[PDB]
């Protein structure tokens, strides 16, 4: 097939520079990671403990860990046609994205993709290996911020409980206008730090995306 | 906002007399008890102004302010601000006309619960007081709903007629 | 929008209120009365004394209301959201 | 029809400058039939249409980030 | 110079039902149009500022709508904190969880922006 | 996930609420109790003279308690952060 | 006294624009009404009930209607002369505030600037009027205080005083619960707004700003 | 000595402007004002009745008059040898700096300099000269929030006294339920605008300060 | 021999200049500091009573003064070679970095460290110290991010008790019903400035991280 | 006195501008002795001190805004 | 890995410098082998790639402060 | 330390300023001894030296505002 000259391939690769830096991680990898991690520190009860650049930093580090083996198909199968030559750059674009896709695919719900099909008029697919790009992104990142709710709800559980409890046995001792939240807070503090919330929740989260 | 302001208050006063008013110790976090019996009437009244029109009715000032002020060197003229001023006034005043029912109302069953005292002194308003008033005032709340109907054109239309004779009358009074 | 159309969403919005705390409302007073009776017939109380009991009361009615208080909340949502293309028109 | 559209354009201005890049290397290896006033235009016609395609990207480059780089 | 307009008039035709005929009648006294019977080609000095004040009636209309059920939660919420003594617990710590648990238990994401989409249709 | 579930993970966290707080709630209403029986046979009192008896008796309660109260808290919360890659699905 | 170029007279005058927020409006105009507004709302028993945004939108208005005299005095003044250039623009600075520093002096305590002279050391000398600025802001708004606390707690007392009495019958009727703030509260608002004190409390504003 | 260039100098001249809102006022001039302004603020109870924007410049007033013997030191010792170009800027920087050391030394605690030394693991330095500035400033930090805390204490001392008094008197005169925190305030208000606490409390803070 | 040209390592020292001050100092040293800091600020009873510029410049100051003997061993161990030309950046990149990841490992939590290698895939490893930075660094920030809390409860525990002392014998008395939180607040204050908690809590974190 | 100072500098940079536009406008219309060379210098020195000046003037407002910008 | 691909593309970038540089250096020595219509060729290609890998740093590091930038 | 470091880069590069000042000045005085192709590539040196120091102030600068800025 024919193939893009040098002079338009790096215009292309500089372009989409651009958009995958910032998107393709905005709404593919980590959307869920940073939306569990905003809401276990507003659950802390201690807005803004933690450094933001610390939690975007290790949001990072964990999103790359997970995606790693994709990462590493893509990069091979990808670069090493590409670096020897073998593969043009259309084909090339396919052909890594394709897992990519595949991926993606195999996180998402089934009516959002039903629905984003009925509302695009696109004809009905008796194969699921077919969804184009256009179609495949809103249900991923639609099903990625509904898991997020509910497992910060799951997060915000325990932390909710010992607030109750800790404001009722203090209004049964007898104490009304003392704030639960200065007194509680040490106490999920010390839950969460003793149970080893932060290693087990990523851990957790790493074990959820895998499977 | 004077109409929404006035709106604002009528709610919260609403709230205040039940279980809302907790906060008048000295200044707390979080106020507890804004959202509760707030934000239910500071944001029903954006509606009723789209009902009639949203910017419509405010543009049509505009251009007419245009007429009587046709941007000079004419200076601002005073005894003005005052007036406008002195309006709110009205966000009190229709407060409490929208407020008449709910106020007497809670009050009489404040005041009817406290006559038990003299058949025993150990109600415990702590215990049963507060969930008495509440089902009454959360009743007394979809029930009234019409009342505030056309209540709420009232202040449209009234600062309507102060801001027109303010925005006609002051190139005329220089 | 008439204003009919303005006013009859604050109506099933404090309804459901209504609808909902009551059973929780009534099993707060229902319990401070009995503790209330208690308090007399010999009324030696601290303060009101009837806290400890209150608190589990209404916290075992959670258990005897539970999924249909929490199923009130989730078909008038989706019956106003049936009507979001339809209460603008 | 957005993507479909931007690969036309790419394709097209790939296209001439490849026929340009293989009609100069056809008449630097002495084929007859080929004018140097003729590749000479060629070439310049295919830097004017790189130059709009730049230029085209970097329009809208900048238009998008600007839409999305804005708070809702 | 032709190409222009009829780029131009099936995008003027699908706006004209976004519009509100109030809007179009305000904006048609404030820069001396013709009204007449019948509407033809509404010039874009009066089009585009009525579909501007219109999809932002409507975006407020339906965002009220979003908002109630999410003060229905917390009105309840507050109600039964302060019937059992806990007046001066703050009920955002305890509602925001139900807010959220409502919320994706409903499906509010899918079927909001499906109603959305129909919303814009018709 | 269904709303049964919910209820489910509210009925399970909730039922903690109650078991952890039994033992505090309990000797302070029987404390109240044991004084108020207690105050008959010259009833005389000043205004309440029971509130004291709570603190020490509570006071105690916990330090008898001690680690099953915090126990419980480690045990429940890690089944729930190990099941995330469950309640997902 | 000569004048300045184009370009340096831009330059001062935005950058003088600038500090409109603070040089010329928290610390000369209604820095005395936001306390009385504030301090209403506490003793009104309703807090955070009045919103903080129309309120300090209410004060700017009757403080600019107060001071249009002054502004008034400096724009047949000043922008007539310019207009006319003949009046230097920095001589117009210098011959707009002293008429204001005579207005300031008005506003300001009998034994308060002598606090700030003694502390700058710039000695007694003679002249009431002839006083460097560094000493009227600072006096200006130390004065400002203690008359805004002084005109406070005038309208405390009458509210302090019917939640008393009314408390004061619950416990010769056997009131002896007893809930004093939810019951005063109807009749604190009915008074206030039945005689209408805002009309008393704009009137009493003017008169006693400007003595 | 030689002296450094011109684009130099200007390059460091501007840079400095960047830290002089911290370096110079921050950590050097009115910390202290200002934790004690706002602690003063919480013990009226009504926060945000004084405006920041009118307290900060309150503070920055307060604290441009307490700094005039240093700043008129430092002013004279770096510009008059520097404005004709006698000495290198470099080292007027450092000869202008030095008394303002040495008034340093004077507020800071001198047990904190002692345990600075040892944590910064400086060998033994003799004479209280000699300090390097690099262990000053974060003592003087520590011994300016260990007398703001002192100072704030202070004060909170009668209003403490006053408000428990009021309370049991109220409780004593046979009712129980009235909230002290809405009947105290006016009463404190009044007894502050009596006092006139504003002026002799800026006095005592600056004598405190000045010495 | 091979190294990089002097363009390429100048753009690689300047791209390092943009992440060095951000994230290899926000999350390498102070993150705990700051994390204290703030749970003290909470622990105070008052939103931000010392001010976040003075926070940061302390922690600045007291990280700076932590690193001292890691920032000597990185300076005589690469900038001296590299200062003279007598060693390239390839490897001097690695050498100085190396005190830094052993400071890292040995400030660091196995269980933390195990479960980022087998999240990683990688468990070839012979010893603690050939770990490379990758895994490192998230297992550290885990650490201190723990360490962090487990200091701030023992922070809050004097607070809470003071507090709930003082509240208990308030309301013993018929008190019940007034906030003790802001009689609270000058107890607090006294305790802190008597035992100089700022001073203490300085040399205990100093020794901290000394372990 | 930061006022005098302040003063002082801006009177100094506006003379120095105000000396340099006088003198090409003296050359504007031939006058003789004025060298092309030397207006030249002149209009870029007022240009560099009208730039420092803009530039001291927004740095320290945006000190000013971020030190009163501030929580109390 | 990222570290890996970054320090291959800044290597092969160092050498194909270095190894233009020594080429010129050798022809201006006056070694015999160097014809003019290398080092100059050689020179420009070093440019080509130092400019694309200037324009992809300022790519990286600008979506790294995008992206690290977010109010979270 | 920090301070010592940058001190003795701004000396440095105020030295190099110089040197290229001076030599530009005894070229220009006739003095015997410049051939004008080193001159300019001197100036060509400090340029790029003081371009080098702005840039890493530039750096430091906007990295120490945006660490202050945090919460």
């Given at each position: 097939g024919q193939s893009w000259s040098l002079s338009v391939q790096t215009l292309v690769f500089i372009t989409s520079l651009t958009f995958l830096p910032a998107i393709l991680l905005m709404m593919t990898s980590f959307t869920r990671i940073i939306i569990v991690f905003g809401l276990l520190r507003n659950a802390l009860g201690?807005?803004?403990?933690?450094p933001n650049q610390v939690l975007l930093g290790l949001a990072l580090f964990l999103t790359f860990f997970i995606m790693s083996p994709v990462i590493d198909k893509i990069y091979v199968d990808a670069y090493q046609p590409f670096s020897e030559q073998k593969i043009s750059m259309q084909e090339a674009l396919d052909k890594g994205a394709q897992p990519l896709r595949a991926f993606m695919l195999r996180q998402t719900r089934e009516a959002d993709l039903a629905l984003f099909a009925r509302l695009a008029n696109s004809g009905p697919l008796q194969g699921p290996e077919a969804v184009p790009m256009r179609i495949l992104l809103p249900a991923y990142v639609t099903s990625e911020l509904k898991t997020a709710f509910q497992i910060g709800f799951t997060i915000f559980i325990p932390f909710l409980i010992i607030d109750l409890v800790i404001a009722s046995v203090l209004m049964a001792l007898g104490?009304?206008?003392?704030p639960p939240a200065t007194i509680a807070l040490p106490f999920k503090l010390m839950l969460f730090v003793l149970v080893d919330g932060w290693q087990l929740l990523m851990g957790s989260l790493a074990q959820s995306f895998y499977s | 906002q004077f109409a929404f302001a006035a709106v604002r208050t009528a709610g919260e006063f609403i709230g205040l007399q039940m279980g809302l008013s907790f906060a008048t110790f000295v200044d707390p976090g979080s106020?507890?008890?804004?959202?509760?019996?707030a934000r239910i009437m500071d944001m029903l009244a954006m509606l009723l102004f789209l009902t009639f029109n949203g910017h419509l009715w405010l543009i049509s000032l505009l251009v007419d302010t245009f007429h009587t002020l046709p941007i000079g060197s004419n200076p601002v003229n005073s005894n003005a601000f005052m007036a406008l001023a002195r309006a709110?006034?009205?966000?009190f005043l229709n407060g409490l006309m929208l407020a008449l029912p709910v106020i007497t109302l809670l009050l009489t069953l404040n005041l009817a619960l406290g006559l038990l005292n003299r058949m025993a002194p150990q109600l415990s308003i702590f215990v049963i007081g507060f969930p008495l008033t509440l089902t009454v005032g959360i009743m007394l709340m979809a029930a009234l709903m019409p009342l505030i109907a056309p209540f709420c054109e009232h202040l449209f239309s009234e600062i309507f007629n102060l801001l027109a004779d303010i925005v006609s009358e002051m190139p005329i009074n220089n | 929008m008439t204003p009919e159309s303005v006013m009859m969403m604050g109506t099933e919005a404090m309804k459901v209120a209504l609808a909902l705390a009551a059973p929780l409302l009534l099993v707060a007073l229902i319990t401070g009365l009995i503790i209330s009776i208690l308090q007399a017939?010999?009324?030696?109380?601290?303060?009101?004394?009837s806290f400890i009991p209150k608190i589990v009361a209404v916290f075992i009615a959670i258990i005897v209301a539970g999924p249909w208080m929490l199923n009130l909340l989730l078909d008038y949502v989706r019956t106003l959201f049936s009507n979001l293309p339809y209460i603008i028109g | 029809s957005f993507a479909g559209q931007l690969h036309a354009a790419l394709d097209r201005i790939s296209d001439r400058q490849a026929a340009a890049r293989v009609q100069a290397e056809k008449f630097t290896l002495g084929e007859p039939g080929i004018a140097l006033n003729d590749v000479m235009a060629d070439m310049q016609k295919a830097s004017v249409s790189m130059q709009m395609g730049i230029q085209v990207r970097n329009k809208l480059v900048a238009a998008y980030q600007e839409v999305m780089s804005m708070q809702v």
């Open positions: 201690t807005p803004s403990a933690p104490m009304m206008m003392v | 106020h507890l008890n804004m959202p509760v019996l709110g006034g009205l966000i | 017939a010999t009324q030696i109380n601290e303060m009101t004394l | -």
